[PDB]
Amino acid sequence: AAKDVKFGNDARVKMLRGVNVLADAVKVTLGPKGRNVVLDKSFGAPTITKDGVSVAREIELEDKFENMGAQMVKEVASKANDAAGDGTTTATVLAQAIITEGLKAVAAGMNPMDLKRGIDKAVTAAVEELKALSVPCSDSKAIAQVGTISANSDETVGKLIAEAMDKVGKEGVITVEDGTGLQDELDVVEGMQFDRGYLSPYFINKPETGAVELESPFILLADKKISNIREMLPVLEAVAKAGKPLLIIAEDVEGEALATLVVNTMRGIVKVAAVKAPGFGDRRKAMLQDIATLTGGTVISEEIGMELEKATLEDLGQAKRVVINKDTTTIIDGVGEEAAIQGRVAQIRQQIEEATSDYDREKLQERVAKLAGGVAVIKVGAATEVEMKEKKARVEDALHATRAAVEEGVVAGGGVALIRVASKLADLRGQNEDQNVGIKVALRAMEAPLRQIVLNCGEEPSVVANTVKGGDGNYGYNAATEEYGNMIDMGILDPTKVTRSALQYAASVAGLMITTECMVTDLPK
Amino acid sequence: AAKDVKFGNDARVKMLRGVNVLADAVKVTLGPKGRNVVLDKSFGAPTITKDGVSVAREIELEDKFENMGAQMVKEVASKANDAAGDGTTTATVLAQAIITEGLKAVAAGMNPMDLKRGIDKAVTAAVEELKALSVPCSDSKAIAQVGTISANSDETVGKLIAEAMDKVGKEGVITVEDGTGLQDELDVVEGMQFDRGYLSPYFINKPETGAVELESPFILLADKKISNIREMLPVLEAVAKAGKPLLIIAEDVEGEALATLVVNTMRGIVKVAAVKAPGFGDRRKAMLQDIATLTGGTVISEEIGMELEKATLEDLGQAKRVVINKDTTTIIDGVGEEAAIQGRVAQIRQQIEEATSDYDREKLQERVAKLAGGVAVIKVGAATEVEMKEKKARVEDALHATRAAVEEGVVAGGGVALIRVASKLADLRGQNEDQNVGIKVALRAMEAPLRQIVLNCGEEPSVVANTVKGGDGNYGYNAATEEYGNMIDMGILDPTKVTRSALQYAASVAGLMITTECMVTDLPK
Amino acid sequence: AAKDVKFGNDARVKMLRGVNVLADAVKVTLGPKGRNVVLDKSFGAPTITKDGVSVAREIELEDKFENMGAQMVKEVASKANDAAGDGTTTATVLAQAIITEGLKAVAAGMNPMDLKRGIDKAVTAAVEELKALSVPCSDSKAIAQVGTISANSDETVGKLIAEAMDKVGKEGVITVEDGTGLQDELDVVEGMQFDRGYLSPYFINKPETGAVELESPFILLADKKISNIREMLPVLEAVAKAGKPLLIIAEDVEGEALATLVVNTMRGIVKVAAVKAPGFGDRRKAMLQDIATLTGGTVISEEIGMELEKATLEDLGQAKRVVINKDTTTIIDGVGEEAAIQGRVAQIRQQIEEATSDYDREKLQERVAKLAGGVAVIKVGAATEVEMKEKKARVEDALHATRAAVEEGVVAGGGVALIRVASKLADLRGQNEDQNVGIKVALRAMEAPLRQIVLNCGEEPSVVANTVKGGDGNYGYNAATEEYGNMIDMGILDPTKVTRSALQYAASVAGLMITTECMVTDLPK
């Protein structure tokens, strides 16, 4: 239809208003002293939440221009949340700071492209500087410490994460569900993890988590493009007779199949989920064979000649559980015999031995790693179900933070990492005045998180920020106790990966917003 | 859709207006001299009630922000009602007082978080002070007295509840039914009680009471989740042939099952209500076996291999009547033979003997307690049906108040307990000026119930409050007779539990509301 | 009446709008290719002028705040005009450029005071750079050249002014009148020069010239502060009998005295003007005695004991013509006998000889200089009266430009002096980022005059400015012939005192207006 076009400074001020609204709403909740934000619910009492993700998710604006500016900032912040699993409001605060200052400079007649270049130079220098500040978190002691800190200062969860990491390995797989007993337990069983997301969001049976949980499902294996609904009617009838949930592994699923599966799930007769095939090409076929070995299933490929119509329940694979993250999968305790798994591992090991290509050898090495290490499973232990769910959530987020710290490292949190790298990069200069201004904008915007935390605490942000800058090393402000001190000693730690991702994504969105003039949208109707 | 966002002081004033409206509407009906409140009935004459619960339930405003604030206060007040049984209007009055004073202080630039900390410290000291002031109510004489006072000064109900408590036990199960003869009767038979709530409010066949009553129903004992309606279609055919209502106890039911059961109940062909299974894991199965032994039913579990499709009426359990409270269940006189009942009791007794874990032994002990003590049945006795209903309601609310007093204790009522606690804590001080102001706000808000009661009586609230404060012990104001005196001599008594719950929940909602800035809601349309 | 107060950024934008309006209106007429501007005349046809002063004088805006901004810029531009004589539009263009860029920077969040400091540092460096670039104009050849260039390329007036200044002296005083014959005439006669302005503008009998012309007037000479009108009634009667205009030398006059003189001049019976006494103190008395010697008058002083009431026509002095200026005064051919003039000159010469104080000796030296050099009179010569007026105006403005060039020097005009200065000062840096920005604002605003001239010519200003910057020395753009070349060779020359004053005053107003927060006015009524 017709579309209103606003280009020039008016577009920029609309975008600025939108990012301002979203950033205020979401930054009010940053830190331990984050002030509550109450979101209206359609039916029943409103929810109260200091979680930045929820308040950001529930933000849409009336007028299209500032609404889409807010949507851009929200999308990049959610991307940052997906990258590291944390640091959403930090990313949005860094965004709001950089966009505000950069758009002020652009209104000041500066060249937007040079500002973009200066901000990019500043942020890459800050990223490598943070990598210089990073403290390794390889020892199990720091693993337990960060697990404790992430989960509201609980030592048991940190201990559990430490033991799981010791058992399954540094880069293994860790999952958590509920346990029957009051005591936490640990076990390791052959499993899986390949990075593929669900085809449609509607497969989520528990929206609050964002994944699915199929207790004892079948699993299908297919190297063939899902073309017609007629191909999987026999398996649908079989699974309906079985009264048991089902999963689908396919090369790709067509939109008509998307509509059919969504309709079937809404009907509730069959609980079917589908996910993209992992890997690619002959590697994809080999790992599909690995999954068939795991679950006792069989790969149905057109080249072989078999068809999805000729599929019996015996041909289908099985597992005792499966969870699909938004961009990852995990099957646990494949029914397939362990002797066959060992044989397949040995076969791929000789494939590694004969391998000459470096990247193919890396693919084979990670294939044997994921096929032999399996998955470590955690079961939470307490008395009542409310504490089951809350402690399960604590374990989940602590595991996310701990793995993020293991991947890259851990730096003194509380927003002092950014302060320290900013003070380090005080002498950075670009190729002209505009690039220098952009660099200074980035540097002064990287002080935003600490200032916001202090403002939420109620103290004067400028005084605390100046005091923190005066100190050196990890000297910083404690929001909880309102006392200065070595941030690492008091346990306030934030994974280097989360801060790096938040900073980089905020810089990316801010640079992309600074260099925008035209903005086409539907008419207000 | 688009969402209007209001953050800052305007959010606070909107929420203050909403709580003011709800608090006025519900506090006008506090105490014995509560003024009547009139509400719409869509068809017919309006209803008239001094009951705070109804007037609070029917309040929800037109503009979104104050509406949602009123919804917060209403939700917390209803939570207090569910926890204790009464004290809803007291909770809302305390919440209004604390909100008004706290927001007035926050407008004065005081730190919201410190105010919340001060209020929390004050209310914790207040709660332990109430526990200090608590008077035990273990004697049957005070049990009868509180039962009499709760039920509009009726001694017969106090006598009945005293006899029932003596017969079954202190922490037994008490139930009230309708009797044939004018004389009141009492009989105790093997029964059940586990704390689980209904899946959907639509199961409620009697909305005014909040539960359901099934005369001589079947009960379907299950162990797995409900995946398809096909699993219990033969059960539905059997219960339709029987023409007698049915209940479902199972691990869980899903959304399509809820829709199916709601549609079936609206049809009226089958009267079916489902409830979540009790316990957790192995003890869940143990108490399911206990239910099987009570009702003569059989546990259906996929692990055993049994399926819901092959369900026969003989396999179904039975009872002579069933009532499911909003968050509790009771089955009375399970048809199952009593012999197996004491066999199971003895078995679990030896399980207690061999038990080494303390909490598992506690679960086994409460299991044998609930399996041996059974349920008390107290059928009301009078001439006509109108007095049947009103006296049944009186027995219900008197039972709630009496058990609440038994659990914790009983303190001087009329709002004097809070006055005495506030006077005791007059010297409490926090860590700075803001926490001190918060503590003083809580303390001066503790005088709201007595002041409101006196204002409803039409006297001068400040004069009566000052006179009560001048006195010591339990010296207070008898609203009914408009004369001072020892509040316990004339029997005006409040359970410690209800006052404690009201105070704590008012403090909690006040802490959440004081520290709120952002408020997102749909546009006014 | 009440007063509307506007402080903050809205004040800056209001002032910016006002100065933008004034600057556009007045800058359209800059340079030789200045576009015509049409003003409005209350009665008759509109006037048409390319003169910047005329268009600026007639601009005041309906909105009060814009009007205050415009009036500030107009005041400082008129002050710049008064300092040198020509360069009003250049001053306004510089002021507009600096104001626009500086207020844009202030909106960019930079410190106004540091911006003002940077601009002041830049303009001081620019002023000393102009003094470096200055070329002496002592030779009569360049004097005739600049006289020709100022007077629309007329060589005769350049010749005349050269001869006159050779006759009198470098720092002499030059005057122009109308001659009976078509041939130009020149003569030197004993005269006077002291710097004092008219007490009220209403004394101006010729508003288009801003001065008074009294043919053969009497001159009063008084050292006493005017007190009452009765003191000069007898002299007023005497001069009314004489039927001749009068001029008054007095220590000072008050409100009622000047009001009565204004009333009398409006009546037209007596055409009397009054000017403040020159200098100060015993020097004032000594050169009042010099004036008495010049005109044959007498000093009337209370200390001597003589009063203004006792004043005969013989006591009054005489001259053959007198002209007042806004801040200057000259009397020509005092009737006083030349022998007395020589005697007084000798007396003050011996006073110089005995003088020991350096500054008193300087006053004595300039006193003898003005008492011996006298005045120059240049009678313009042509046929008709219209060319009489236009050539007299040409002589006046050429004389102003030539004396301005003689005082300080002459630099390559056409706006390239400032271009070269800005290019020279490209490496100047302040004490921080804000001062650096202010310096760059001043430097980029120095290019405004040439850009505006080129834009008036219709060419692309950026291209011509870049070409001129590329060249070095006095290479520049000729607006009239639209071809590049050497300014000195092409005769486009500007006094170094006309450009310095414009630049300094533009910088002064820009600094004074950048650091303006609050701005009160009267209500719009």
Ligand SMILES: Nc1ncnc2c1ncn2[C@@H]1O[C@H](COP(=O)(O)OP(=O)(O)OP(O)(O)=S)[C@@H](O)[C@H]1O
């Ligand atoms: N008590 C504390 N005092 C100071 N800084 C803290 C404290 N607790 C956490 N942080 C820091 O807060 C940053 C993360 O922001 P928070 O909102 O507090 O936590 P979060 O779980 O990351 O929430 P978001 O919305 O994802 S940023 C990290 O740099 C932590 O080191």
Ligand SMILES: Nc1ncnc2c1ncn2[C@@H]1O[C@H](COP(=O)(O)OP(=O)(O)OP(O)(O)=S)[C@@H](O)[C@H]1O
């Ligand atoms: N005769 C009395 N004199 C003084 N106070 C009384 C008297 N009778 C009851 N009260 C008090 O009045 C309050 C009763 O409040 P209600 O009007 O029943 O509402 P509520 O108990 O706060 O909550 P609900 O859900 O409405 S019962 C309690 O604090 C009693 O202690």
Ligand SMILES: Nc1ncnc2c1ncn2[C@@H]1O[C@H](COP(=O)(O)OP(=O)(O)OP(O)(O)=S)[C@@H](O)[C@H]1O
């Ligand atoms: N032929 C020319 N080529 C280029 N520039 C010229 C030429 N003739 C004059 N100029 C410049 O044009 C400007 C003359 O400006 P004007 O229009 O006279 O206003 P102004 O001199 O700034 O002030 P006033 O009071 O109006 S005279 C000076 O900067 C001259 O150096």
